[PDB]
Amino acid sequence: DAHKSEVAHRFKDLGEENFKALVLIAFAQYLQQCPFEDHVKLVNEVTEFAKTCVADESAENCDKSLHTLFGDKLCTVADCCAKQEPERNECFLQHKDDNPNLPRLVRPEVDVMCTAFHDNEETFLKKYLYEIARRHPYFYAPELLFFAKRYKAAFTECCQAADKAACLLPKLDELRDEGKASSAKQRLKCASLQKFGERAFKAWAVARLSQRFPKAEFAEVSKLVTDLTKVHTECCHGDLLECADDRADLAKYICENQDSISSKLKECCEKPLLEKSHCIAEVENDEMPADLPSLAADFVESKDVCKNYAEAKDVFLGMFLYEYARRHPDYSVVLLLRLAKTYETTLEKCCAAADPHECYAKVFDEFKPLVEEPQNLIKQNCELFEQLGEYKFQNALLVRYTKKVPQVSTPTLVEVSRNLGKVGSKCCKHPEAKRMPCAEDYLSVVLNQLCVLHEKTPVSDRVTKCCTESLVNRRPCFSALEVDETYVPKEFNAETFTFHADICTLSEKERQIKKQTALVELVKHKPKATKEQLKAVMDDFAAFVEKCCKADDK
Template identity: 45%
Template sequence: SIFLDEICQVDKLRDSYGDMADCCGKADPERNQCFLSFKVHQPDFIPPYQRPAADVICKEYQDERVQLLGNFVYAVARRNPFLHAPAILGLAAEYENALKSCCPESDVGACLDAKVQHVSVIKERAKHIGVKQEHGCRILEKYGERTFQASKLTRMSQKYPKAPFAELVKMVHDVKDVYKECCEGDMVECVDDWSELVTSLCSKQDVFSSKIKPCCELPVVERTKCIVEADFDDKPDNLPSLVEKYVEDKEVCKRYESNHDAFMSEFVYEYSRRHPEFSTQLILRVAKGYETLLDKCCKTDNPAECYGNAVEDLNKHIKETEDLVKTNCELFNTHGEADFLKGLLVRYTKKMPQVSTDTLLEIGKKMTAVGKKCCSLPEEKRMSCSEHYLSIVIEDMCKRQESTPINDQVSQCCNTFYSSKRPCFTAMGVDTKYVPPPFDPMMFNFDEKMCTAPPAEREEGQLKLLVNLIKRKPQMTEEQLKTIAGGFTAMMEKCCKQADVDACLGEE
C-alpha cells in the first residue's frame, strides 16, 4: 500500500502509463490487482540491455559497487516484470561473482564471455525463471490453492522422497503462502519469507535431502536458486507396492470418506516418491483418475470389486503420456528441428485455424524449443521436462483465449482440469466448424524475395505459406500436402535459376 500510495502521488502518471493511472481510483486490494494486470512480458519501450565496456564495468564495480549492482537489479527487473525479487537478487549475486573473478584478469571481456554467468546467459535464465514463476502464479490464481498445493506436493515428494509426509505437507503450505505474497507483488515480504523458508529447509536438510547440503553453505541470496536446481534425492530402497494399501485394503473407502483431502494428499505423496521419472501433470492425472474411481465405487454395494481394476485403469494415463514423449522425441531426433516444426504447424493449424499465422508460428517455435530442450535429456527426465514446458505454452495460449476466443474445442480444453489440458490439446482434431475465409491472393504472394532473401527469412516465409495453405484446406491429407510440397520445391529450384524470377513464379 505504501508503494502504491507513492506511485499514485506522481503528477504525470497518466502521461507515462495511460490507463494504468485509473487504478489509483480503486481501493486495495482491487488497486493492487489493477496495477498487476498491466504487467507485460517485454515492454516495447525498453531497449535490449547492452553490457558496458569491460574496463568501465570493473572501474564502476571498484568505485561504485552499490550503484552498479542497483543498476543491474533495475535493468533486470524492468525487463522481466514477472520475475520474483529473490530470483533477481540471486542473478545479481551471480553477476557480482563473475565480476569478482574476471576484473583482476588481463582480458576482462574474454573472461566474462567465457563465464557460465556471462550476461547473455543471465538474461536467458531471467526470462526462463520469470516464465516459470508467472506460470506458478497463474496456477494459484486460476485453479486455486488445492491444485497449486497438489502440484507442489507432487514435485517435492519426487525431489525429497525420504522426507516424512508431515514435513512435506507443512513445506508445501509454506511455499503456497510465500507464492501468494510474491504473486501479489509484495516483493519485500516475498524476499523475507523465501529467506525464512530456505533457512528452515536448510535447518532440516538431514530430513529432506543430502543433495541440498552444498546449497545451504552458500550466502542467503544464492541458496534459493541452488536448492530449486538441485537434483532429486535417491528414493528409499524397498518401498512397498501401493496396491496393497490403496486397492486391496478393505478399509480404502472408509479411510477415503473419513478424510478425503488427507487421504488423497498421502496418495499423491506415496505415488510421487516412487516415480521421479513421471511428470507432475501425469501424477495429478493418475490421482484424479483414482479419486474419480473411488467416488464412483464407494457408493456401490461391492466397492472392492468395482475398483479392483484400478491399476489397469490408471496405467492408461501412463501409457498415453509415455507413448507421446517417445513418438515425439523419435520424430525430433530422427527428422530434425525443421521437419518437427512443420509437423507441429500442420497439426495445430488444423486444430485452431482461426489463430493468426504469426501466432501459430510463435506457438510452433515454442513447442519445437521444448522438443529441442527435452529430447536431448536422459530418457527418465524427458517426460517431466516436456509436460512441464508444454503446460506453460498451453496455459499462455489459454490466457490469450480468455480475451480472444479461438473456437469451441480450444475453449473446452482450456476450461478442463489443469493436469488434463495437454492430453486434451493432443487429442483435439480438425475444427470441423471452421469455414475458410474467401481466397486472398496476398496469402500466397510469390516474388523473387523467396529466392534472394537470407535463409532464415526464406524459411520463415515458407512456413507462413504452409500455415496459410492449411487454413485454406484444413481437411487436407498428408499425401496431398506432400504432393504440393514437392511441386513447390520443384518450382523454387526452377525459378530461382531464371533471370526473371517473378515472371517464372507467376507462370508456375
C-alpha cells in the first residue's frame, strides 16, 4: 500500500488534484523554457499512468522510481538525458536557471482576467502555477499550492464584486509580495543544503525551532528537525511529491502533540490542510518556560563536560544550541550558530589541554563581542534609515556597492540594493528585542540572493569568496570588501540615459526603479564622482522626467 509502486503511493496520499499540480510544478522548474501546453500534456500522461498503478501496483513500469518516471517524461521533448537515473536528476538540478531569460508577466485588465477565469478556470489556475514555477525553480512546492488556493479564492470573490478592480488588485499585490518573499526564503534553505550540507541545515533548524518551541524537550526538537530536514531535502532535490506528503505528515504530527510542543498552535491546527502547514511554519515563538537554569552549571562549571562531549559530540553540541536558542528568542539564528561554533572550538582545544576545566571556564565571556556587533550595526542602520526614508536609503546603498564591485550587472545591483534597503522598512519598526532576528535573518536571505545571482554570471573573485565561505559570516565578509581601485570606467553611452515617452505610462514604482538603474550606470561611467555630482544628475533627471510629460508634446 506504500512500497511496491511509489507513484501510486503518492497519488493515494495526496489525491489527484494536488498530485497533478505538484507534477506540473516539477516539470516547470526543470524545463523552464518549454511552453505551457506541452507541460500540461506531459502532466496528464503521467497522471493517467499513475491511475493504472493505483488500480494494479504490479502493472508494467509501476515499480519505477519517481525520478526515473519523471526524468523519462521530460526527456521525451541539455546533455542530462543521456545519463543514468541518479546522475540524470543531478544534471537537471544543476541546470535550473535562477534568473531565466523570460519576459516579465504583464498583468492584463481586471475584466480581461476575470473573463479568462470564468472561461476556463482549470487552465487559468494551471497557467498561474506554471508561470511562477518556471521563474522560481526552487519555490517551496507545497507552499505554492497554498498560494494558488488563495489566488483562486481572490478571483472567485472579487470577480463577483460590484467594483472588481478595487477588490482584486490589493489581494493580488500582496500575493505577489508574499510570493517573492517566500521564494527568497526557500532559496536560502536549498542553498545551505546544497552548498554546506545537512549538518549545517539541521543546526539552523535546531536553533530556529528551539526559539519557536522553547517548551518542547530536546528529544522533541530533534525529532521535528529531523523530519523538517527530510521535507526540505526532498523539495530542494525535486522530490516534490514526497516533500508535500511528508510536510502534511509533519503538520499532522505537530497538531497531535501540541501539549509538548507549543501553546501557539491551537488556531493553526483548526485550519484546512494547506493553510495549517503554512500557519505552523510562521507561528509566533511560544513564551519560554520560567525559572530555566543557566547553561553554566551543565556546560561550563561541570567537571564532566569533556567526558559528556566526547561520548557524543554532535548530540552534546546540539543540546547546547537548543538550550541557548530556547533562552534567546532575541538573538538571530546566525548569531546563535556562531556562538555554538565558538563553544565547539573551545571544547576541541580545551579538552586536549592539561587543565580542561580552567581552560574553558571563561568561554561564555567570549560571546559578549559576538552579541554586541549585530546589535550596534542594526541600531546605526535604522537611524540612517529614519533620516533618509527607504528610497534615499536604497540610493545610498546603490552608489556604495556599485563602487565596491562595479563589475556586477546593473540588474543585480539594483535588485539586491533595493532589497537590502527594504530591511529597514520591515525591521526598524520593531523594538530592540525583535530587531536583530528580523534584520539579520532577512539579510541572510537577500545576501543569498546576491550569491545565487552572482553564481549565475560570476565576475568578482571576492564575491565568490564571501559566498563560498561560512554562511554565518557572509554579512561581515560582504561589508568589508573595499572599493575596487583597478576598475577602469566604461565609456559614456548616451543611449543609456536616453528616455522615451513610454516612461510616463509606467507605474511610479517602475519609474523609481529606472532612476535607480540610471544611477548605477552613472557611477559605472564615473566611479570617482562625489555625492553632489550624483545628486545634481539624479535631481536633474527626475525633474526632466516630470517636465517632459506634464507638458503635452510627446
